[PDB]
Curated annotation (Swiss-Prot), chain B:
Present with 11600 molecules/cell in log phase SD medium. Probably forms a homohexamer. Interacts with RVB2 and may form heterododecamers with RVB2. Component of the SWR1 chromatin remodeling complex composed of at least ACT1, ARP4, RVB1, RVB2, ARP6, YAF9, VPS71, VPS72, SWC3, SWC4, SWC5, SWC7 and SWR1, and perhaps BDF1. Component of the chromatin-remodeling INO80 complex, at least composed of ARP4, ARP5, ARP8, RVB1, RVB2, TAF14, NHP10, IES1, IES3, IES4, IES6, ACT1, IES2, IES5 and INO80. Component of the R2TP complex composed of at least RVB1, RVB2, TAH1 and PIH1. Interacts with SPT15/TBP and HSP90. It comes from Saccharomyces cerevisiae (strain ATCC 204508 / S288c) (Baker's yeast). GO terms for cellular component: chromatin; Ino80 complex; NuA4 histone acetyltransferase complex; nucleus; R2TP complex; Swr1 complex; TTT Hsp90 cochaperone complex. Gene3D superfamilies: 1.10.8.60, P-loop containing nucleotide triphosphate hydrolases (3.40.50.300), RuvB-like helicase, domain II (2.40.50.360). Belongs to the RuvB family. It is found in: Nucleus. It catalyses: ATP + H2O = ADP + phosphate + H(+). Keywords: Acetylation, Activator, ATP-binding, Chromatin regulator, DNA damage, DNA repair, Helicase, Hydrolase, Nucleotide-binding, Nucleus, Transcription, Transcription regulation. This is RuvB-like protein 1. ATP binds at G59, G60, P61, S62, T63, G64, K65, T66. Its main location: nucleus.
Swiss-Prot record, chain C:
Its main location: nucleus. This is Chromatin-remodeling complex subunit IES6. The gene is IES6. Signal peptide: none annotated. It is found in: Nucleus. The chain holds residues 112 to 162 of 166 of the full protein.
Swiss-Prot record, chain D:
The keyword Cytoplasm does not apply. Probably forms a homohexamer. Interacts with RVB1 and may form heterododecamers with RVB1. Component of the SWR1 chromatin remodeling complex composed of at least ACT1, ARP4, RVB1, RVB2, ARP6, YAF9, VPS71, VPS72, SWC3, SWC4, SWC5, SWC7 and SWR1, and perhaps BDF1. Component of the chromatin-remodeling INO80 complex, at least composed of ARP4, ARP5, ARP8, RVB1, RVB2, TAF14, NHP10, IES1, IES3, IES4, IES6, ACT1, IES2, IES5 and INO80. Also belongs to the R2TP complex composed of at least RVB1, RVB2, TAH1 and PIH1. Interacts with SPT15/TBP. ATP binds at G61, P62, P63, S64, T65, G66, K67, T68. It is found in: Nucleus, Nucleoplasm. GO terms for cellular component: chromatin; Ino80 complex; NuA4 histone acetyltransferase complex; nucleus; R2TP complex; Swr1 complex; TTT Hsp90 cochaperone complex. This is RuvB-like protein 2. Its EC number is 3.6.4.12.
From Swiss-Prot, chain E:
It comes from Saccharomyces cerevisiae (strain ATCC 204508 / S288c). Present with 1110 molecules/cell in log phase SD medium. Transmembrane segments: none annotated. Component of the chromatin-remodeling INO80 complex, at least composed of ARP4, ARP5, ARP8, RVB1, RVB2, TAF14, NHP10, IES1, IES3, IES4, IES6, ACT1, IES2, IES5 and INO80. ATPase component of the INO80 complex which remodels chromatin by shifting nucleosomes and is involved in DNA repair. Its ability to induce transcription of some phosphate-responsive genes is modulated by inositol polyphosphates. The INO80 complex is involved in DNA repair by associating with 'Ser-129' phosphorylated H2A histones as a response to DNA damage. The chain holds residues 1017 to 1083 of 1489 of the full protein. The DBINO region is involved in binding to DNA. The gene is INO80. This is Chromatin-remodeling ATPase INO80. Belongs to the SNF2/RAD54 helicase family. It comes from the Eukaryota. It is found in: Nucleus.
Amino acid sequence: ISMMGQLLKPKKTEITEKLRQEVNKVVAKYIDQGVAELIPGVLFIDEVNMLDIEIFTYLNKALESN
Amino acid sequence: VTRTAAHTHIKGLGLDESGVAKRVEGGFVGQIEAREACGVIVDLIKAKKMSGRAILLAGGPSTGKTALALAISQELGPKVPFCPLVGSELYSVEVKKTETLMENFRRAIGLRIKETKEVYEGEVTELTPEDAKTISHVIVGLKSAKGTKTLRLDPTIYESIQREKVSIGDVIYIEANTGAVKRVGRSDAYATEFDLETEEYVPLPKGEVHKKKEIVQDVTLHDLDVANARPQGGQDVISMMGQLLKPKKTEITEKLRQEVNKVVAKYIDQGVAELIPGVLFIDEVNMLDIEIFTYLNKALESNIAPVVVLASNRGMTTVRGTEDVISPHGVPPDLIDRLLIVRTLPYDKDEIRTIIERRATVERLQVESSALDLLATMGTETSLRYALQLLAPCGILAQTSNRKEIVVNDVNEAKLLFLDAKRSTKILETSANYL
Amino acid sequence: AKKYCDVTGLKGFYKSPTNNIRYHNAEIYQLIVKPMAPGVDQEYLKLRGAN
Amino acid sequence: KSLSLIAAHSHITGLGLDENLQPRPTSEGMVGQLQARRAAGVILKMVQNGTIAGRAVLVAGPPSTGKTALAMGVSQSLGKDVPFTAIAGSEIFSLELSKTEALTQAFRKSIGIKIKEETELIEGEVVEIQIDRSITGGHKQGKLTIKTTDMETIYELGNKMIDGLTKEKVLAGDVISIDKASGKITKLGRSFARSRFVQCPEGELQKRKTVVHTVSLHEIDVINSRTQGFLALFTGDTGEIRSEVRDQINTKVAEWKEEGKAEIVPGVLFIDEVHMLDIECFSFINRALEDEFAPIVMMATNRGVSKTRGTNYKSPHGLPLDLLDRSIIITTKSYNEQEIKTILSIRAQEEEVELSSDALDLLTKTGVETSLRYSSNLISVAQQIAMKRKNNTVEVEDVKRAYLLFLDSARSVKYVQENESQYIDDQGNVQISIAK
Amino acid sequence: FERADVDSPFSFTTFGKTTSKFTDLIYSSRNPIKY
Ligand SMILES: Nc1ncnc2c1ncn2[C@@H]1O[C@H](COP(=O)(O)OP(=O)(O)O)[C@@H](O)[C@H]1O
Ligand SMILES: Nc1ncnc2c1ncn2[C@@H]1O[C@H](COP(=O)(O)OP(=O)(O)O)[C@@H](O)[C@H]1O
């Protein structure tokens, strides 16, 4: 499967939240082991008026995560 | 214990042997004429002769249409196929809506197959292949707690045996008709050959080696259409990881359906199969486009179409996908010319009280008779569904104060805590900033 | 052949590495097998002929 | 576990209620809204009883009045092992899934199956491994000495255990855990031998451990459908799962429930900003609530008599009357000055910010003047101004500096309206030059 | 001061590592995420 993953054409997919929770758990374990350091950053969205109401409504939820 | 969700006090139409509805029977209160018409439709479905007959039951909201459809499904039994559907489920992004409509049409035609299951299981005591590089056959001797049995096998099953890495002393599982081979594990008699081992150890089967059973397989025509039209190809019996290429739905041609019909018609004439037509139920039929309404006219004139049951709660409403077409119940008149319409009437006070008492009995709640008339007055003033949905907060608030009987103070408290649509709308109008 | 605990006669899961006596669980090992007198291990192994 | 910096609802640890379902004035990070908290406690007991299914609860109120915080308190008070799916309204408009299919997948992620099974493990500290091999490697003889703090043993090793031990290379002094049936060996680390670091196990070597699994119905639907494997639970391209597999899963779950091999747990599906859904989604929800395998749905909205999406008429809360007939409505209210002051005090203690009393009074005044969230946001940027001049406690002039620097909505609207020639209007007309 | 080293992707694997006439090496990389 890992060999055939390099030969197929890549495509964006809807990554489920379960994978994100598992990645968060593994990263939290790495931080607790003392080998990792978390560096939050800045996301810059220029020309914000091109967004529509659906992205704004999802952004309302997404700003309230941790 | 038991989960009750908006239904399951309905067990049938409550008719007698002559088709006359009793007033309180089968969990149904009132609604004599619609129940009698649904009984006539149930008899017509059990006749199993006609194709493409359609009825539609129309009325107000919260009046008993979906309850009548589920009562029909309970009256027919579990061997008759019944496909529930909502009108918004036909809009898929993988195939056209007409293909989805034909798929749901062919999902409601069933089949019954008489089959025989034959199983050998037990510990392997002898594995001697014989040739004439090509093995002619292989002799396997099984063993259980009631004795042994020696079997001959063709090399095709032997290839599956060496697929499973089966040695002397393993407990296996062989199906005679299909040739399926499953390895359960090593026997417990060989558990002390090593102190630490990778193999798992299971005891001997206490039953006989040879077991026989008669089973009845229920399939639909859509399952055969899916199984004959896999685009990438076949699949193995065990596949924990999926295919590398994602197979999506495809527009299945008419030729495949004709060939499937030919094969099934050949199998019926030998007495192997039995054809059971069923019911396709579509709720909220006003959410259909004009194109699906047009294709329904063609699909209802086929030779294999089942009985279609539609529901709608609209009045004189514009059809979706059009601009200036006004027709009753949101259904276009060329389709309306093809069905029979069953009217469903609303309720007065005492039937609302009796339904509330029935739902209190089903949910295992004890209500005082003083609170029941107040609940009926609340139901007539606002909604039947609002009175029905207020029983469980009343029960929880009664159980909180160590009481097993509903007191009217709990009904007043549940009225104060939870509002209906009208009081919330009155809050909306008399407010300043977005409620 | 099946393996049995030398002290109780139950199913012997383990075996001590010092005197090669099979035992059943931890309490038998702590109370009997480990603080055992010398020479009794050979008499225990005399029963199954492993001395 | 569960890494997190600081959330906007991180101070809420649950509903503040006693044994008689009465709300405390301030408990578990929740202040005010006593009727809403009592109603949410009733809904929590509805979920915890688990004897009824498919009930819709609508939470409606003005914006920034405890709507999402109530759902966070319910989810924190629910505890682990009970499912809780929190989606937004606009998340179901997919490109490879239909809206009804996305709603079905959101519905079937909130019902769990409890399965209890027991396994056997061997966990201890490796003392000595002795491996004897031939020239060609046809046969291998092995001895492994392993121990706990209470027993010592030596095992005669088979071939497959030897191959499973040279793979995932173990040495003396390691602490390992061995499953006999599957052959999986996990290195838990090294013991306390200086000569990561894990204390040596105690008790018996061969323990019988029982684990309780909780599997959602959607996972069984994905696994039983043979088109894709279990990896579709992570990649997300399930792609329009059919209905016959769902019927088979429902019948098999109902069959397992009678024999006691499994238990049904129901959960809560929370749909924030429910007014963004289309009319067809509402029509699907109208029939999805009348099933035995349906969770309790909580919806939140702040619209008042808005236009329903996909139609051309206005409806209360942006929802049609068929969905409003099936629901019970919890209404939230606005806050007084004392509730705002207490909420600002709790948010100050959460962010480890020391506030003077006069700064708290100024923040309460500018909270009841403009908004609660503006005064909540001003604290963390006033603390940086406090730290810039090398001071710990936030004073009055730091809050005044933060009020001067960062604008609110009402001042920005006025500043736009006085200088409308400098901004682009609805007609795309702007003036960039200063003169003329 | 510091020496430039190999440019490799970050291995998101758990495998058989040594906590120190031939040596045996077997492919043993697994995923940290377990279902
Ligand atoms: N004759 C009846 N006896 C008992 N319960 C009824 C009767 N008619 C309707 N109900 C109940 O009232 C509710 C009406 O729901 P439903 O029929 O789905 O509404 P609609 O007709 O708008 O689809 C159902 O929960 C059903 O159990
Ligand atoms: N009763 C309360 N207890 C604690 N915090 C509250 C309370 N009510 C509101 N808040 C705070 O106010 C903010 C807005 O609440 P929220 O309900 O998320 O906004 P909206 O009403 O727009 O959904 C949240 O960050 C929350 O922390």
